[PDB]
Enzyme design. Structure first.
Site, short mmCIF file in Angstrom:
data_model
loop_
_atom_site.label_atom_id
_atom_site.label_comp_id
_atom_site.label_asym_id
_atom_site.label_seq_id
_atom_site.Cartn_x
_atom_site.Cartn_y
_atom_site.Cartn_z
N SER A 242 42.64 32.58 41.68
CA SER A 242 42.71 32.08 42.87
C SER A 242 43.13 32.75 44.26
CB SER A 242 42.90 30.71 43.44
OG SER A 242 42.46 29.96 41.84
C1 LIG Z 1 42.81 29.90 40.42
O1 LIG Z 1 44.20 30.41 40.19
C2 LIG Z 1 42.40 28.52 39.50
N1 LIG Z 1 42.39 29.46 38.54
C3 LIG Z 1 41.38 28.84 37.95
O2 LIG Z 1 40.01 27.89 38.40
C4 LIG Z 1 41.64 29.56 35.98
N2 LIG Z 1 41.26 29.35 34.84
O3 LIG Z 1 41.85 27.99 34.95
C5 LIG Z 1 43.30 26.46 34.60
C6 LIG Z 1 44.06 27.50 33.89
C7 LIG Z 1 42.79 25.67 34.60
C8 LIG Z 1 41.75 27.19 33.13
O4 LIG Z 1 42.61 26.56 31.77
O5 LIG Z 1 40.47 26.40 33.39
C9 LIG Z 1 41.03 31.01 35.81
C10 LIG Z 1 40.42 31.84 37.35
S1 LIG Z 1 40.36 33.32 36.63
C11 LIG Z 1 40.67 33.21 35.53
N3 LIG Z 1 40.55 33.88 34.27
N4 LIG Z 1 40.86 31.69 34.61
C12 LIG Z 1 43.49 27.76 39.82
C13 LIG Z 1 42.43 26.46 39.16
N5 LIG Z 1 44.10 27.63 41.20
S2 LIG Z 1 45.51 27.26 41.38
O6 LIG Z 1 46.20 27.12 42.86
O7 LIG Z 1 46.39 26.00 40.84
O8 LIG Z 1 46.46 28.24 40.47
#
Ligand SMILES: *C(=O)[C@@H](NC(=O)/C(=N\OC(C)(C)C(=O)O)c1csc(N)n1)[C@H](C)NS(=O)(=O)O
Length: 499
Positions: A242
């Site tokens: 993100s």
């Molecule tokens: C961006 O950092 C966004 N991340 C994701 O959507 C990813 N996985 O999310 C979690 C940790 C919840 C999961 O277990 O699915 C992701 C992006 S790249 C990768 N390898 N995984 C998070 C949701 N946004 S934030 O602003 O809340 O951190």
């Protein structure tokens, strides 16, 4: 060789304000001629005990080296310790005045500064990177020895030793101690495996702080595992997630097809692309404006914008800011990561690229990319040394698009439902949190401040938090808050969140 080397004085390494970080300290090395020692055997146990050697094992070593004219006894003693062994008057025992590095800040700048070996040669970090500037040139002295190898006199100083040159790094030691203290505290508070924190001067391209956990004392080596030696901010590649959404948003705003007030339907919080399913963290939304997509961190919302504008425009911004690109820092073992490129971008790759799933970057690269955005879309080349004459910089994002994106990122921090833990006491700050799945996680926060005249960009990476909290805005954002707050004070940055 009828000559013996004259080690030169290694260059002083300091922080930006002249605080010593690597000091060549005088040491004494003892060597001996066994052909002379072989006619003074009754002195060997006294010499063995002064050297901390076992009586019999020392005698064995001499008897085995009997025909040799040179052996090392011990290296890097204090001038006082060495003078004490010379005071025994053991025939054939000689001294050599050498240099050994002392690191005053120790574990605080271990990864940036690096270290020299037993031979005083740069092995890691700055010590290796700038070895030629720092070493100088070893001198030469011609000697006179009888046929038994007994050094009679120094005939001449054939070649005079030319000392190394001083090196002032871009690192501000005060900011370095502050980032180090707080990253250590965040690692302990969360039961995290590792982490990195990078501080950038957005105007000069200067790396003001670069700290990693775990760290080591460069002064007290011995037993050191590889985990502690890894300069993570430069050598650990990770999915930025993100934290790259601001750059996808820059591409949207630069397209002519999008404005901040624009609406995107993200209901029901999922989007299927063939067999792949894009999923949002929160799934209680329908219409979200462009700022709301960054606040809620919607993967569906950013994916749909990516489909509209095309991945080629997004790739171009990410490439230009330096994501998965060579830093230009000739830093040892520094990784480049990967920014995938396609001749023709498929639907699934367009979406994952826009939300940082399809890419690997370093914390240095991420901090440089946020510095470009903070510096009104202009990228100043990175430097590990103090910048007195600032290079021109490259405009990678239009100033108007950069200004709009800064404003949305201030809302990410300051708005209702936003990253409230990243808020900086008495200043307006801007940034974006990230959480990457490695279940094992990587907690990220990237941002800059003051939001009304940016001066500093910062990235916080906390690898594998083991407590209940794993999200960047919960784990990394409070680190950004404390370190940023402290750094703006140290740099006399006027508060812009005036009452
Ligand atoms: C961006 O950092 C966004 N991340 C994701 O959507 C990813 N996985 O999310 C979690 C940790 C919840 C999961 O277990 O699915 C992701 C992006 S790249 C990768 N390898 N995984 C998070 C949701 N946004 S934030 O602003 O809340 O951190």
């Amino acid at each position: 060789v009828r000559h013996i080397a004259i080690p030169a004085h290694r260059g002083l390494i300091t922080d930006r304000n002249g605080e010593p970080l690597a000091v060549s300290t005088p040491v004494t090395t003892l060597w001996a001629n066994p052909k002379e020692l072989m006619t003074a055997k009754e002195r060997w146990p006294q010499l063995a005990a002064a050297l901390g050697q076992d009586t019999k094992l020392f005698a064995d070593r001499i008897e085995q080296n009997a025909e040799r004219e040179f052996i090392y006894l011990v290296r890097g003693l204090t001038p006082e310790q060495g003078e004490g062994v010379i005071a025994l008057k053991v025939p054939g025992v000689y001294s050599i005045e050498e240099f050994r590095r002392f690191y005053p800040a120790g574990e605080v700048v271990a990864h940036a500064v690096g270290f020299t070996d037993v031979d005083d040669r740069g092995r890691e970090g700055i010590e290796l990177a700038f070895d030629e500037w720092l070493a100088g040139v070893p001198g030469k002295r011609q000697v006179l020895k009888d046929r038994r190898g007994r050094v009679i006199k120094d005939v001449q100083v054939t070649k005079n030793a030319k000392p190394g040159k001083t090196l002032a790094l871009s690192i501000d030691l005060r900011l370095q101690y502050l980032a180090h203290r707080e990253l250590r505290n965040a690692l302990l508070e969360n039961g995290a495996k590792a982490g990195s924190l990078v501080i950038m001067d957005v105007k000069t391209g200067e790396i003001l702080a670069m700290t990693n956990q775990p760290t080591y004392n460069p002064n007290n080596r011995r037993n050191l595992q590889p985990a502690a030696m890894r300069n993570r901010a430069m050598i650990d590649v990770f999915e930025p997630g993100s934290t790259v959404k601001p750059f996808s948003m820059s591409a949207a705003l630069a397209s002519g097809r999008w404005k901040p007030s624009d609406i995107v339907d993200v209901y029901p919080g999922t989007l299927q692309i063939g067999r792949y399913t894009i999923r949002d963290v929160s799934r209680n939304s329908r219409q979200l404006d462009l700022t709301g997509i960054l606040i809620k961190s919607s993967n569906v919302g950013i994916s749909k914008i990516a489909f509209d504008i095309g991945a080629e425009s997004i790739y171009s911004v990410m490439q230009q800011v330096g994501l998965g690109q060579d830093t230009g820092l000739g830093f040892p073992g520094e990784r480049v990561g990967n920014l995938p490129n396609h001749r023709k971008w498929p639907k699934a790759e367009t979406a994952t690229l826009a939300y940082g799933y399809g890419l690997s970057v370093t914390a240095i690269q991420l901090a440089h990319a946020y510095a470009a955005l903070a510096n009104d879309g202009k990228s100043v080349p990175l430097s590990m040394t103090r910048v007195d004459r600032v290079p021109d910089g490259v405009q990678v994002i239009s100033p108007e698009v950069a200004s709009t994106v800064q404003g949305m990122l201030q809302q990410v921090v300051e708005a209702q439902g936003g990253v409230f833990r990243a808020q900086v006491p008495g200043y307006h700050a801007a940034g974006k949190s990230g959480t990457a799945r490695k279940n094992a996680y990587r907690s990220l926060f990237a941002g800059f401040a003051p939001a009304t005249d940016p001066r500093i960009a910062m990235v916080v990476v906390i690898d594998e938090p083991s407590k209940a909290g794993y999200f960047g805005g919960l784990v990394s954002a409070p680190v950004f808050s404390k370190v940023m707050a402290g750094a703006l004070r140290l740099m006399n940055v006027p508060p812009d969140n005036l009452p």
